[PDB]
Amino acid sequence: NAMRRNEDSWLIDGATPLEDVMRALNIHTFPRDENYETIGGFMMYMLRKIPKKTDFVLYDKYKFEIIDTENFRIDQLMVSFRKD
């Protein structure tokens, strides 16, 4: 991708519990089945395809972007407000 506009964002560990992230972002509508315990797990589901850096999921008010993968998981992601 080209250099991104600097807007408010958070850098988050892919292993952060899903519920913890939803709570902190004030998301009240999300999967409650617990099949994907972590934020990166849920992102991988939503992507369907094999994850790679720069891939992103639009969910609620937000864009969740993979910063890096390691050990076949989303290691770090960035969250910002979505712009669509």
Where is the binding site for Mg(2+), in residues?
68-70
Closer residue to a copy of itself in complex, CB, 41/76: 76
Among 11, 37, 45, 58, binds a copy of itself (CB under 8 A): 11
Among 10, 45, 58, 81, binds a copy of itself (CB under 8 A): 10
User: Which residues, 6 or more positions from 59, have their beta carbon under 8 angstroms from its beta carbon?
Assistant: 27, 30, 46
Rounded Cα distance, 28 and 76, in Å: 23
Residues 25-54, one symbol each (x = binds a copy of itself by CB under 8 A, - = not), give: ----------------------------x-
